[PDB]
């Protein structure tokens, strides 16, 4: 399925994902498109930070959902 991610430039990118994909894998697919290393990524959906180790299905992220990417560091 397709989901959307709003990135640090404000652009909305598309990702090709499956419900059993881990958040770490979603971060790796963001790196593949946008170059941002996964340890610097924090993904937000419906007001929750998405934990590494959990899956898209754990957060009920269904097709055509939009996630928000923010920087995880302290500075920025």
Numbering used by the authors: 1 to 76
Lines quoted from the article behind this entry:
Here we used genetic code expansion to express and purify multi-milligram quantities of Ub bearing homogeneous phosphorylation at Ser20 (Ub [pSer20]), Ser57 (Ub [pSer57]), and Ser65 (Ub [pSer65]) from E. coli and to solve the structure of Ub (pSer20). We obtained crystals for Ub (pSer20), which diffracted to 1.55 Å and showed clear density for the phosphate group. Serine 20 phosphorylation has been detected repeatedly in human, mouse, and rat (Choudhary et al., 2009, Lundby et al., 2012, Manes et al., 2011). We conclude that Ser20 phosphorylation on Ub changes UBE3C from a dual-specificity ligase that makes K48- and K29-linked chains with unmodified Ub to a ligase that makes predominantly Ser20 phosphorylated K48-linked chains with Ser20 phosphorylated Ub. Our results suggest that the phosphorylation of Ser20 in Ub may shut down the formation of K29-linked Ub chains formed by UBE3C, and this may enable the proteasome to resume proteolysis and aid cellular recovery following proteolytic stress.
Ub is attached to a target protein through the formation of an isopeptide bond between a lysine in the target protein and the C terminus of the Ub. Ub is a target for post-translational modifications, including acetylation (Ohtake et al., 2015) and phosphorylation (Kane et al., 2014, Kazlauskaite et al., 2014, Koyano et al., 2014). Several sites of phosphorylation (Thr7, Thr12, Thr14, Ser20, Ser57, Tyr59, Ser65, and Thr66) have been identified on Ub within mammalian cells.
